[PDB]
Design a protein around this ligand. Structure first.
Ligand SMILES: c1cncc(CNc2ccc3ncnc(Nc4ccc(N5CCOCC5)cc4)c3n2)c1
Ligand SMILES: [Cl-]
Length: 273
């Protein structure tokens, strides 16, 4: 089902960044005549199958693979502003004094932009839950930002701090509910919990959840029922949505459809203000 692209049709331009299990290049792709794309260089067939199967406005567009020798390539649409975690951090309260001279309006993202970012990640999660698909690793580091604040889920691995994953098989324990940490029970309800944690990342401008703690201390705090504090930039109504995602019992957590509807209502009420 995965579309195969000829190596000759892929012209690598320059590296955009590099992660753990691969590199990311800006490239030009022919016969897709001349298109600007992002190429990830390294199961490969299973991850490619998933990206082929998924098709939504808030899931990164996938064009196919190149298995003509080595290295294995994955072709995606180019998302200009990169990963959402770095985007949040570089557009936070300390965006002006740290940004470059050419950078357009350096400063923190306003409430309207934070809600639009949150609403687009939720739209992608609504699509995944409708297909009974469990992501298992939802976090801003796995999201991408394109021109005009277009936000999409881009991956189904890399990290900002090495502490994002815990060796139990690497688990993103800071994003996980107690049933996932304790029994590896992954469901659309464990994904809604991770979405509540993504909301916390958005409203802290990309801070690591439980940053003050080591992964073993975070496991203890999470399983004991400790809740992440309300971020300074988070309105009380957004924190109430986070708490709805964080109900201890998986079946008591708000559905992603209701979370999305509430984020969309708040975003619409703030558009003209
Ligand atoms: C990340 C999240 N989700 C999916 C991925 C792979 N998939 C895709 C697809 C399309 C892409 N279009 C542009 N950029 C992409 N990724 C990219 C570019 C630069 C960085 N860095 C490295 C660290 O310092 C700052 C710059 C990071 C990631 C990208 N990744 C990657
Ligand atoms: Cl509340």
């Amino acid at each position: 089902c995965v579309h195969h692209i000829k190596r000759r049709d892929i012209v690598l331009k320059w590296e955009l960044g590099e992660g753990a299990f691969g590199k990311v290049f800006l490239a030009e792709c022919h016969n897709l005549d001349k298109m600007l794309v992002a190429v990830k260089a390294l199961d490969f067939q299973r991850e490619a199958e998933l990206l082929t199967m998924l098709q939504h406005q808030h899931i990164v567009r996938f064009f196919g693979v190149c298995t003509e020798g080595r290295p294995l390539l994955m072709v995606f649409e180019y998302m200009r502003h990169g990963d959402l975690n770095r985007f949040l951090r570089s557009h936070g309260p300390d965006a002006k004094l740290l940004a470059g001279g050419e950078d357009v309006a350096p400063g923190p993202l306003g409430l309207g932009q934070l809600l639009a970012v949150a609403s687009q990640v939720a739209a992608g999660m609504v699509y995944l839950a409708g297909l009974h698909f469990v992501h298992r690793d939802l976090a801003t580091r796995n999201c991408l930002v394109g021109q005009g604040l277009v936000v999409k889920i881009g991956d189904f691995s890399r990290d900002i701090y090495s502490t994002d994953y815990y060796r139990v098989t690497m688990l993103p324990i800071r994003w996980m509910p107690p049933e996932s940490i304790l029994y590896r029970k992954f469901t659309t309800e464990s994904d809604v919990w991770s979405f509540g944690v993504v909301l916390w990342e958005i409203f802290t401008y990309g801070k690591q959840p439980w940053y003050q703690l080591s992964n073993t201390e975070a496991i203890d705090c999470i399983t004991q029922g400790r809740e992440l504090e309300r971020p300074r930039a988070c309105p009380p109504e957004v924190y109430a949505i986070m708490r709805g995602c964080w109900q201890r019992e998986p079946q008591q957590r708000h559905s992603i459809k209701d979370v999305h509807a509430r984020l969309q209502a708040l975003a619409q009420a703030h558009h003209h203000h």
